[PDB]
Symmetry: D3
Subunit: 294 residues, 6 copies
C-alpha cells in the first residue's frame, strides 16, 4: 500500500540569464516485488511528494490489470515548464536523470520513466542520451532506460494512438483499465528496445510466403478435382488482406498485442464481477482484480 522508495532531490542550475536556481524533484517507486518500476515524469509547480506517491501506487495497480510486469513509479520536478527556455530544460532534465541514476531510480532493469502532458519525447531523448552516455555506456539495454522516445532513437510505432486506441478496444470488449493502452504500448516499446530489433522485421516475409503457399495449396487441391491449368483461382488474397501483407509493419504487431491485452484484461475483470458478483460497477472489480494479482 505505501511506496517502497521515495527519492527527494534538490539540484542547482544556472539560469539562462546567469541566475542561480535550486530545482526540487521526486521519484517514488512503489512495489519492488515487480521490477523494473515504470512511470511518468511531471513538470508542474503542483508536484508534491504525496502526489507522486499516490500516482506510483495507482501505476502499480494499472500495470497489474493489463499484466504488464512493471512496478509503479512516478516522478515530478517542481518547475513551470513555460518559464524556462529549451536550453535549461535540457539541463534540468539531464541533471535530474543523472541524480536519479546515481541512486538507482533510473535504469532499464530498475526504473523506466515515461512522458506526461508536461513532458515530451524530446525530454525522453535527453534522458536516454544522458543514461547512455554516462551510467549506461556499456549496458546493452541502455536504450530501454526510458520509453516514449522518438522512432529514430528507439521509439515505437503506434504510440500516438495507443491510449485512444486502447480506450476503444476496452469498450468494444464491454479509468484503471481503459487508460492502460499507453502503459501497454510503453511495455511493448521497452521490449522492442530489449529485443534490439523491431517487431516482425524477420517474420513478415516469412509469413507472407507462408500465406501464399496456403492459397496456392488450395488451388492445386481444387484443381485435382476439376481439370484446369490455374483456371480456378483460390490463389488470390482479398483486397483488405493484400493491403495487410504489403503494408505489414511494427505498428500492426503493436495493435494486435494491445488488442489482445485489452481483450484479456476485460474478461478477467468480468470474471472478477462474476465472483463477488459486483454489479455494473467495473471500477471496484478492476481494483479487486489488480490487488488480487499484486
Amino acid at each position: 500500500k505505501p511506496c517502497n522508495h521515495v527519492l527527494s532531490l534538490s539540484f542547482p542550475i544556472r539560469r539562462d540569464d546567469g541566475s542561480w536556481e535550486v530545482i526540487e524533484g521526486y521519484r517514488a517507486q512503489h512495489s519492488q516485488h515487480r521490477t523494473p518500476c515504470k512511470g511518468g515524469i511531471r513538470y508542474s509547480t503542483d508536484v508534491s511528494v504525496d502526489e507522486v506517491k499516490a500516482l506510483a501506487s495507482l501505476m502499480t495497480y494499472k500495470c497489474a490489470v493489463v499484466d504488464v510486469p512493471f512496478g509503479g513509479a512516478k516522478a515530478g520536478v517542481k518547475i513551470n515548464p513555460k518559464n524556462y527556455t529549451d536550453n535549461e530544460l535540457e539541463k534540468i532534465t539531464r541533471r535530474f536523470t543523472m541524480e536519479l541514476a546515481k541512486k538507482g531510480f533510473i535504469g532499464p532493469g530498475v526504473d523506466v520513466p515515461a512522458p506526461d502532458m508536461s513532458t515530451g519525447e524530446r525530454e525522453m531523448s535527453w534522458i536516454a542520451d544522458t543514461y547512455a552516455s554516462t551510467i549506461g555506456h556499456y549496458d546493452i539495454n541502455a536504450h530501454a532506460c526510458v520509453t516514449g522516445k522518438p522512432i529514430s532513437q528507439g521509439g515505437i510505432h503506434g504510440r500516438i494512438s495507443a491510449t485512444g486506441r486502447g480506450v476503444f478496444h476496452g469498450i468494444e470488449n464491454f479509468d484503471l483499465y481503459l487508460n492502460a493502452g499507453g502503459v501497454t504500448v510503453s511495455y511493448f516499446e521497452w521490449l522492442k528496445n530489449l529485443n534490439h530489433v523491431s517487431y516482425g522485421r524477420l517474420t513478415f516475409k516469412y509469413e507472407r510466403d507462408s500465406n501464399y503457399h496456403l492459397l496456392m495449396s488450395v488451388q492445386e487441391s481444387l484443381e485435382r478435382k476439376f481439370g484446369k491449368h490455374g483456371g480456378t483461382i483460390p490463389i488470390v488474397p482479398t483486397a483488405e488482406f493484400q493491403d495487410r501483407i504489403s503494408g505489414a509493419s511494427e505498428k500492426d504487431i503493436v495493435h494486435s498485442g494491445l488488442a489482445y491485452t485489452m481483450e484479456r484484461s476485460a474478461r478477467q475483470i468480468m470474471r472478477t464481477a462474476m465472483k463477488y458478483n459486483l454489479g455494473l460497477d467495473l471500477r471496484t472489480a478492476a481494483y479487486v482484480n489488480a490487488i488480487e494479482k499484486v
Copy 2:
C-alpha cells in the same frame, strides 16, 4: 569428462529451537565451454560430492541431446528436508543461494538451478528472491537466475506436464532422451524470463487475424466462380481449430517447441544409429550423439 568446477560449502544456521547446525552443500559445474550451466538442487542425506559430479556430467550430455545450449550442473545440500520446519528451510535455501552467488555458482548467465523431487517451486522463489534482492538487484536478467518458479514469479505454463509430455512425444517419434522434456521446458522458461514477455503475447491476435483473412480470401475466390453473397462458406474454421484460436496461450507454444525438440532429437539419434549402424540400442546411439556435439 570431469567437472570444471566443484564448490563444496559449509554454512551455519540457527535451528528453530535455538540449536546450532552446520549445513554442507555442493555444486558441480561440468562444461564451462557451454554457459550457463543448468541443473537441479537435491536435498537428501545421500548427497555426496561424487554424486553431484556424476549428475552434472549427465546433465551436460542430456542438454546436448536436445540442443539445449546449457552446460551441466548439479547441487545437493545434505539435510533430510522432513526434519526441518519451513522456517529454516527458507534460511538454508536462502543462505545457500547467497554462498553460491558470491562464488559465481548461481546466476542467469552463469548457473541456473532447477528443482528436484526434494526441492519445490517455493525453494525456487526463495532462490530467486535472494538473488534478485542482493547480487542481482540491478541485473535485468535476475529473474532468469533459476527455473521452475511459479507463474506469478516468472514461471512457465506447461511445466507440470513437461517431462510426462516429452516421454510421450519421444516415443511417438519411434533415459538420456525421453527424460529431456523437463530440461527443454526449463530452457524455454529461462528464455521467457530473458524475453521479459510471455510467448505469443504479441503474436496471438495478429496470427488469428491472419488466419481469418485466409479463409475469408478463399471465399471471395470461390465466389468469383459461382455467383453468391457470402453463400459458400469457406469463411468458417473447424471445431478443434476454433478452440485453438480462442484458447491459444503460452503453453501451446511451449508444447510445440517441446514437440519440435523431441522430434528433431529423435531423428538425430536415428541418424546416429544409421552411421555406426548400432542395433535397437538407442542408448549408446544417444551418448555417441551427445558426445559428438560436446
Copy 3:
C-alpha cells in the same frame, strides 16, 4: 564525418622460433550515437589508420541503408597472415582481443567485430573465447561479442550465401546497398546470440499445425456443401510447400529477414531518387538516403 574513437595499439608476441615481435593494430569506431559499433578485422601489411577510419565511416552509412542499428567500426592488424603459423595467429588474435577489450573497443553492447577475407571463423572463435573467458565470463551476452562464428559456437545458418544472396535480392528489386547482405545477416547473428535461441525453434511446429488446421478447415467448409467423407481434398499442401514445412529451419527465417531488408531498402532508395529526382544513379541516392538517416 570523422571517427569518434580510433585506438592504435602495439603489443609484443613471442614468435614461434623464439623471436620477438611487436604487432601494430587499429580499431576505429565512427558514430557512437549508434551503439554497438560493427565492423570487420583485416590482417594485411597494407592496413593503415586512415584506411580503417575510411572503412568505419562507410560501414556506418552501409548499416544505415539497410536499417541495421549499428555504428561503423573497422580494425586492422598489420601482419601478413601467410608468414605466421596458426599457433601465433591464435596469440596475435587473442591478445589483440584482450587489448581492445580493456579499452572498450570490443563487446556485445560496445563493438562487435566481423571477419574479412584475411580473417576467418576460427579467428572469430578465438575472439569469442577470449572475451567469454576474461572480460565477459559473467556477461550473458558475451557470445554476441563477435559475429561470423561457427554454428557450434553460436554462428548462424545462411551466412555463407548472405552477401551473394543479398546481391541477388538487391537487383531483383530493381556497392553501399548490394553489399549489405553480410551486414544484415551479421545483425541477425548478433540478435540470435542475444536471443540465446535459434530462430523458429519454438515457432515451427506451432506454425505447421496452424497451416494444417487451415487446409483442414477449408475441407469441412467445402464438404458442408457437397456431401462426402474426406472426399474433396483441400487438406493437402502443394509439393514445394510441404518441403517448406518439413524443412523449415533457421536459415529460412534468415533468408526472409534478408529479403525483407533488401526489399525495404530498395524502395527507400527509389523514393530517395523520387525526391531529388536523381537519374539512374542509385549511388548518390543511397548516400543521400544513408546520410539522411544518420
Copy 4:
C-alpha cells in the same frame, strides 16, 4: 543549504509473535560535493524527514569545522527500540541497511553511518556484516562502510572517550566545535579501516629504537667530554616517557590526531573572529568558518 538527496523508505518485518509491521525510515545526504557522506542513525518515534534533513545539514558544517572531508548525512527509523526484541532489531537494522545499499545511501565511498544514543555498536556490526555479506563482499573497503564498530570488527581505540576528550581539548584551546571529537575519531576509524592496519602497528618499534639511539647518542657526546664508561647517564628516559614507549598503542595516535584537530580548528575559529571581529560569540564565528570552507 538544502539536502541533495533524501531517501524515504518503508519495509515490512515479521514481528516476533508473528504480527506484520511496516517500518518507515529516512536518510538525508546533504552535500555530494564532499563524499562520502557521514552521519548517525536514530531509532525514535520522533524521527521525521525534516529532522534528519536538519541534522544532515548540521553534520556537513560540523565536519567542515574540524576539516573532516565528509559530507553530512543523517538517518532515522521510526520505531521505539524498547518495544522490539533484539531478534527483530537485527532484522529491522539488517533490512534497512539492505534498502539503503541498493539505492546508494550506504557504502564506504558513498555514505558512512554512525551510531546515536538509540543506536549501538551491535547495530554497527549488523550494518557492517550486512554490507560485507551482500553488496560489499568483493569490496576491499567494505569494512569502512560504517563506523562505531567494536574493536574485534574493525573498531578503533579511544572512541568511548572521543567526545568527552574533544570537549576538553576544545576548551583548553580557549556546540558545532566542541562536539566534533566523535566526528573526528569516526573519521580516524574510517581511515583505519581503509588502511587495513591499526595506527602505529609498523611505527612503534621503529620509533622507540630511534628514541633510544638519540639518548644513547647524547651520552657518547657527553662522554667524549669527561672520561668515563657509561658513567654519565643521558641514556635513560624519564618515568612518564618510558611508560609512553612501553604502552604506545593505537589510542595514543588517536588522541594526538584528535588534539591536533581540536587545536587547529580553534585557531581557525579565533582567526574567524579576528576578521569580522566578532566578540566573545564563538558560535557565529564557527558557522562563518564552516560555511566559508563549504
Copy 5:
C-alpha cells in the same frame, strides 16, 4: 619503446556564439606494465599524435628515474586556448574527460592526468568533477583520478615550488632527472588522495610530544648528576626547531619526500656512471638507469 595504447578522438562542441566545432584530441599510454599511467594534457594547435607518443615514452623513463611507480602517458587537445571563452573550455575539458573515461584512458588505477603550461588547476577540477560525477561516483578513489588539483578539491601543499625545489635538490646532490620534482609531488598528491587524509594529520602532535619527552628526559638525566630543580635546561628546543614543530604541515612532509627522492635518484645515477664509467655526461647515465629499471 612504442606506446601500448594511443586513443585519437573527435568530439563536437557548440561554440559560444552557436557555431559548431569538432575538437580533436589524443592520449598515448606507454607502458601498461606499470599502472596507472601518468601524464599531462596540453592544449595547443601544435599537438600531434607523434608528439604525445614521444612525450609519453619520456614520462615513463622520467617516472622510473625517481622511482615513481607510474607508466608514462600524455594527452593533447588541438585548440588554441586563447580563442575560447572559459565557458566552452569547461565543455571541451568536461567532454574530453568523458570520452577518455568510457575508453579507460582516465581513472585513478588507470591513467592519472596532470596539467601543463596550457592547462591549469581549474581544468583539473573539471576533470575531477566530471569523473567523480559520472564514471566514478561510487569509486572511493575517484578524487585520485587527476593530480594538480586545488587544495580545497584534494590538491597538495608544496606543488607550486615542486619543480623549482627539485631542480635545486637535484643539483645540491651533485632534464630527465632535475625535472622530476613535479612528477614526484604529483605522485605524493595521488597518494594523499588515495590515503583520504593529509600527511602528518595524525602524526604531528604525537611526534612533538615524543620530541618533548626526549629533551625532558635529557634533563632528568643531567639533573641526576648535579643537584637542581629544573635548573639545567636541556628541556628547550632551538629556535629553528621550535618553529619546525609549531609550523609542521603537509608541505614539510612533501619537502622531505621530494628531497629523499632527488637524493636517492642522484646516487643511483652516479652509481650508473660508476658502472659503465661514463664521464661527466649524466644524461646517458640517467637513461641507462631508467631503461635498466623499466
Copy 6:
C-alpha cells in the same frame, strides 16, 4: 572449524610435446568472517582436498595469533613440478589463477595467495600479471592480489629473512607462533601494495631532520650553561645510529613491525597461560589464544 568454501578444479593444458593433460587443483577458504583469506599454493602430487582444508584452518589460527586480519586459505595443484618445463608451468599457473579468479577464490579483497617450497616468486609474478591483465585491469589494488612477489613487481624487502628472523624474535621473547613471521611480512607486503608506496618513502628525511634538530637542541641547551661556540658536542650521533639514519630503508620498518608483532603475540600467549595457568606448554596456550580471538 570446517572450511566455508572449497573449490575443486580440473583444467586442460597442452603439454609441451603436444600431449593433453587435465590438471586438478583445489583452494579452501576457511573463515569468511575475516576477509581477505590468505594462504599458499602447493605443487605436489601429495596435495589432496583434505590437506588444503587442514592447512587453511591452521592458517586462520596462525593469522589470529599474530593479529594479521586475514582468514585462512590454502591451494594445491596436483603436479610434480619437476616433470614440467617452465613453459607449461607458466600455463598451469596462469590458467589456475584464471579459474580461481572467475569464482572469487583470488583477489586483493578476497583471497591473497602466497608461495610454498614448491612455488616461487616467479609463479607469484604470473599470478599477479594474470589477475592484473584480465580480472583486475581497472582494480587499483590488483597488485595486492598476491604476496611473495619480486621487488620490481611490488615485492617487499626483508621477505627472505622474515621466517628465520621471526623464529629468532619469537624465542628472544621467551609452531603456530614462531612460524608466523612469514605470515606477518606477507601482511606487510599486502599493505605496501595497498599503500602504493614503500614504507618510510616520505618519512625518512623528515625523521632524520627531526633527529638532527634534537641533538642540535641539546647543544644550545648545554652551551647556554658553559660559554662556547659549538664547543661541546652533543650534535653528533653515535656510530650505529648514524649508519641507521644513512641506511634507513623499507626493510628497517618491516623488521620493526615484525618484531613488534612477535613481541606482542608472545605477551598474549604468556597471558594465555597466566589465565588457565597452563604449564610450559605454549602450544595449547597459543591455540586457546587463537581460538579465543576467532
